[PDB]
Ligand binder design. Structure first.
Ligand SMILES: Nc1ncnc2c1ncn2[C@@H]1O[C@H](COP(=O)(O)OP(=O)(O)O)[C@@H](O)[C@H]1O
Lengths: 290, 338, 371, 262
């Protein structure tokens, strides 16, 4: 079966599994990896797998949003999806390595170009913080609902309180270059790994891909909690609130942060047959046996 | 594309020390994890479902950390003591973390009646728990939920004061514990009853969320009260089965669990759950007058030569051609007289 | 009220009756006799040839020959004589007024159907005639549309499976082991007792003996032991000339050639093995129904104990989980005609008749177009 | 298990007559219908998408009645005139009914520049159209939609007064028409424009209904104003990308790409 049968409301996910069957993401082979770096080869795997995983959960809105990662092997480089190709068809070799200013370092496997306007915000965030290596910008249907609301995010769920401090950026939407960039830069100071745009969507930064995915998934879950909680009562009927610092104090060779859920989802993606090629801390579900 | 995983690999692995009843308990408690996965209420393990093995020795079945609900098998689950130390480890290569078990232990020290615990983190249940009001009796499912207790949860259950406060406020006879801003906890004597209550809470939570979203205010919902009538839900599950005798008597969640578990067995999930009510498909019977009943319920030796026969007849025919005179055989009695 | 005619032909028996009746009107052997002795009696009744029931009365002065052997006609003129006797002497109805229904074996050469159609339109001016499969009509007489049927006549034995009213042509199995060959074998094994039968009338006498005093053994070796060790399995037949013979051991020996053709030396397998192979040739999904519905047809299957032995032999080759049952209607001799009496009575069957006028532009091959 | 249905099958028939680039553009409509089935927006038969063939002689393409959106092919489309009478029926053995085309015919009689019309009955757009506030500028996609006009709908366009009311309600320049208690209608110069506008409109409607149900008050939401806002193809890249997956998956579409891609 080239195409899986479609649910009444889940056809796009079924096509995502079908395209996972048809086109593997580990496009790099032994002969096809000539004149290519090792760390970049490792990072393209994670980035392409993240693009493939983003469309499955529904956090993909055509080609308007982008997910960027930073490789600090050379002086100055970044990776991004080419413009004009959706999330469900992204492979490791099809990703484009570009400069901070948007200059295309190498064309890559694909022929299509790169959008500078989408990369402007990512460039602003990357130039603002040197420690940030991954930026994920998504637009879920509940996230723009909570973002356009006056009060903003509320400490209603432990997922919301796991985010800690959150930054807010007002949507003026004039997008004239450098001064928009500097408003982005000093509207998000030190730390504050989660940024909320008032109308465009949600964005999370992270030192690694796994940590950024964990933060954005916590933000999405907390948003889904917050919408249903505040829909019933929106004011003097006091929904139960927790102190952030005080509940955080009571919340309180080891496994790294964010790798557990990411590796479990890689176990999904390999069980289906996407052939992700993600490096596994524990490649076997069960023990050694024979 | 192979999402079928065998849920009972105890016989295949043969590398574990099982107790008197582990063969049934492990499959029974992995089935509910698979059902939670299929309904999509939870996919990433936060130690949702815990089981108690025996009353004489307090051992408890919990899921290993870092294992998704799709990957849960019966042999992969581990058993621990009430303090939290590992007694016997499953056939899963993962670091052992029993941090989330302690809250479940806070249930086990209080009530000896409860045997299985399910914790829910669904958006609807958390919306109802975080709501200022509780589960409002506005639906039939909320009436079938029953009485319930609310408690404030703050992330730790390790000091003695929080544990004794929870055991005091939980009460002697309560089945549902609502943790504020965290969700719901269902207590069960049996796995089927607790899964029944989990399903009814999820349905009632979704109904309440949709209802309070639809109408601004509680007074517009014209809710009924459970207390005024005080029914005993008598007369439910009237049965006219043919194989067994017709009785009203059934447990709270057996009949719903049997069908789900037979669903699981049909595809190829090799579950070891014993069905209380056996099922047989048979072809239907006819009572047309056309149908007629059935009536019932070396001679030759192995090594020989044809050329020998031909040579023999040639020897006889040669004597015929020669015509040599020869007398017949004589008796030995006449041989004596000569 | 013009009603159709159903005429069932088999080697040794011809039946005929009006459509929609419970009983056929005429049943008589398909025999043709010609005088053999010098006829010297001036003025009294002599004829060139006798046919039907009248010929069987005068077996002493007649040579009796069958026009059909093994379901294939040998002399068409004798077949015309039998058909004329059936249409005129037995039923006393005009053949050109009523339609006639005809039956035949499933597997047969090309020329038989064409010659039969040509003779039936040209000689008798039949306005409409149709050809049907015998075993399919027997299954319709049982009243189930599915199952595998075994029809064993005096000409040939054949098993066909029918699923949802369709007989699969690939799964049809035909074995040339019939009751006339059993009669010849019974004559050969009665030779060794001291009684000798050579003429054709003596063959009919042997056939009557076989019909009266034969049965099927459940266990062959045990019945040989019982018959050798005791005289309980002995009956006496009384010949038409007054002589008395003792059938003795041979009673279960003649029908056992149906199950083991090694007695006759035939290369083919037994009848139960033939039925089992015919079931094997079908699809798996329907095999349950093929093991659930099996009916016996034909006069050869009237031997006592045929159903029990058939069920045991099929169960031996069948899988252990399968359920085997055998249906044997008491009127299994005339089932085929009964099915014909069903098939002509339907309101959708009047359009199934072959038009007389359409044959004029089509020709003798028209049945292959319509049947 | 029947396999997926090919979208372009007009080569198999080779009996219907073709005018200009119809061999291409028919397929475009089919793609749009398939796209609806990929989004769960509509899976039951209705007059959703109609297309004008040429600027002259007033020929239009509509979907046959009773055919679900998954089974629409290129050769199954129905060609009618402005009056709704069948001119060239498609290769679909179903009875024909053109009572739902009349509103689209009125819109076509209003604007000669309007070529493609998209109508949907999804819960979000129906809730927004039933709402007296209409579409609110509380999301980025709502600003991307543009400006729309609101029209009270009785349900039938056979009356002349309702027709002239529709022309004086639509105005000279408008691309989105909101029918009260019935939904939204997207107008486009091409199929790409109509698809892009209706997709952004539904995204904005979902955001608006979610935020308005969450807050419980219109003044609880922040309000954006139009002052900040106020080759050369608006919406061909997105539809071409969806076309690229459709061709890579196995759908035998006849769309020619603007660039040689890989
Ligand atoms: N009562 C009976 N018991 C046993 N065998 C019988 C009996 N009647 C007929 N037969 C056998 O069946 C044969 C007749 O079969 P029949 O049904 O006439 O075949 P068809 O009609 O197909 O020619 C006879 O040769 C005879 O040997």
């Amino acid at each position: 079966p080239n195409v899986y049968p479609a649910a009444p409301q889940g056809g796009m996910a079924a096509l995502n599994m079908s395209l996972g069957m048809v086109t593997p993401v580990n496009d790099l082979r032994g002969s096809d990896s000539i004149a290519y770096d090792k760390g970049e080869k490792l990072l393209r795997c994670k980035l392409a797998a993240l693009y493939r995983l983003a469309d499955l959960f529904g956090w993909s809105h055509l080609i308007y949003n982008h997910i960027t990662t930073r490789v600090s092997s050379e002086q100055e480089h970044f990776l991004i999806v080419p413009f004009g190709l959706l999330y469900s068809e992204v492979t490791a070799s099809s990703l484009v390595k570009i400069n901070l200013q948007g200059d295309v370092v190498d064309r890559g496997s694909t022929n299509l170009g790169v959008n500078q306007a989408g990369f402007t915000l990512h460039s602003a965030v990357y130039a603002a913080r040197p420690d940030v290596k991954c930026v994920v910008h998504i637009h879920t249907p509940a996230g723009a609902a909570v973002s356009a609301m006056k009060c903003g995010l509320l400490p209603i769920s432990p997922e919301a309180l796991s985010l800690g401090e959150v930054a807010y950026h007002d949507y003026h939407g004039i997008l004239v270059d450098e001064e928009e960039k500097v408003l982005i830069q000093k509207n998000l100071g030190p730390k504050s790994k989660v940024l909320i745009l008032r109308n465009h969507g949600l964005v999370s930064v992270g030192e690694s891909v796994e940590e950024a995915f964990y933060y954005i998934h916590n933000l999405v879950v907390a948003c889904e909690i917050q919408v249903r909680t505040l829909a019933s009562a929106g004011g003097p009927d006091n929904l139960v609130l927790l102190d952030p610092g005080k509940y955080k104090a009571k919340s309180r060779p080891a496994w790294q942060i964010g790798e557990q859920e990411f590796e479990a989802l890689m176990r999904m993606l390999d069980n289906l047959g996407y052939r992700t090629g993600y490096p596994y801390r524990y490649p076997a579900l069960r023990e050694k046996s024979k | 594309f192979s999402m079928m995983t065998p849920i009972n690999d105890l016989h295949t692995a043969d590398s574990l020390n099982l107790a008197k009843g582990e063969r049934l308990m492990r499959c029974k408690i992995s089935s509910v994890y698979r059902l939670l996965d299929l309904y999509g209420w939870a996919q990433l393990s936060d130690t949702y479902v815990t089981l108690r093995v025996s009353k004489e020795q307090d051992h408890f079945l919990i899921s290993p950390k870092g294992v998704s609900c799709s990957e849960v098998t019966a042999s992969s689950l581990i058993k621990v003591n009430i303090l939290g130390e590992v007694v016997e480890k499953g056939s899963s290569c993962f670091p052992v973390d029993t941090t989330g078990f302690c809250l479940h232990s806070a249930i086990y020290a209080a009530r000896p009646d409860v045997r299985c615990i399910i914790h829910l983190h669904t958006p609807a249940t958390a919306a109802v728990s975080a709501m200022k009001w509780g589960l409002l009796p506005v639906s039939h499912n909320a009436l079938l939920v029953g009485d319930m207790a609310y408690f404030d949860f703050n992330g730790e259950m390790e000091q003695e004061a929080d544990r004794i406060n929870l055991q005091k406020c939980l009460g002697p006879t309560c089945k549902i514990l609502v943790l504020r801003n965290h969700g719901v906890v269902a207590l069960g004597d049996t796995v089927e009853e607790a899964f029944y209550k989990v399903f009814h809470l999820q349905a009632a939570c979704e109904i309440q969320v949709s209802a309070l979203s639809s109408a601004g205010g509680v007074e517009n919902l014209i809710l009924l009260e459970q207390e005024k009538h005080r029914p005993h839900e008598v007369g439910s599950v009237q049965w006219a089965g043919s194989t067994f005798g017709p009785m009203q008597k059934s447990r709270l969640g057996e009949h719903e669990f049997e069908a789900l578990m037979r669903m699981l067995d049909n595809l190829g999930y090799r579950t070891g759950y014993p069905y209380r009510y056996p099922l047989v498909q048979e072809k239907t019977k006819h009572k047309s007058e056309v149908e007629i009943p059935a009536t019932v319920t070396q001679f030759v030796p192995l090594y020989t030569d044809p050329q020998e026969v031909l040579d023999m007849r040639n020897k006889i025919r040669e004597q015929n051609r020669q015509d040599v005179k020869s007398a017949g055989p004589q008796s030995q009695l006449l041989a004596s007289v000569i | 009220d013009i009603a159709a005619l159903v005429v069932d032909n088999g080697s040794g028996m011809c039946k005929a009756g009006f459509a929609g009746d419970d009983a056929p009107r005429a049943v008589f052997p398909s025999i043709v006799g010609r005088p053999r002795h010098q006829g010297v009696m001036v003025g009294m009744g002599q004829k060139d040839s006798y046919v039907g029931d009248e010929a069987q009365s005068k077996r002493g002065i007649l040579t009796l020959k069958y026009p059909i052997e093994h379901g294939i006609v040998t002399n068409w003129d004798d077949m015309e004589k039998i058909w004329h006797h059936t249409f005129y002497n037995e039923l006393r109805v005009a053949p050109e007024e009523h339609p006639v229904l005809l039956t035949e074996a499933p597997l047969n050469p090309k020329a038989n159907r064409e010659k039969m159609t040509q003779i039936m339109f040209e000689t008798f001016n039949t306005p409409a005639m149709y050809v049907a499969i015998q075993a399919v009509l027997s299954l319709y007489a049982s009243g189930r549309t599915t199952g595998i049927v075994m029809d064993s006549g005096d000409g040939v034995t054949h098993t066909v499976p029918i699923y949802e009213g369709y007989a699969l042509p690939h799964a049809i199995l035909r074995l040339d082991l019939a009751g006339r060959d059993l009669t010849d074998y019974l004559m050969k094994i009665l030779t060794e007792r001291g009684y000798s039968f050579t003429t054709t009338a003596e063959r009919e006498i042997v056939r009557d003996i076989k019909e009266k005093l034969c049965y099927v053994a459940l266990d062959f070796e045990q019945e040989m032991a019982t018959a050798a060790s005791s005289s309980s399995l002995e009956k006496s037949y009384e010949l038409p000339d007054g002589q008395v013979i003792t059938i003795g051991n041979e009673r279960f020996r003649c029908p056992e050639a149906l199950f083991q053709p090694s007695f006759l030396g035939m290369e083919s397998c037994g009848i139960h093995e033939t039925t089992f192979n015919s079931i094997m040739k079908c699809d798996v999904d329907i095999r349950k129904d093929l093991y659930a519905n099996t009916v016996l047809s034909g006069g050869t299957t009237m031997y006592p104990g045929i159903a029990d032995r058939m069920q045991k032999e099929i169960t031996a080759l069948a899988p252990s989980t399968m359920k085997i049952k055998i249906i044997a209607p008491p009127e299994r001799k005339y089932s085929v005609w009964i099915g014909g009496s069903i098939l002509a009575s339907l309101s959708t069957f009047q359009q199934m008749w072959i038009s007389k006028q359409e044959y004029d532009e089509s020709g003798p091959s028209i049945v292959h177009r319509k049947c």
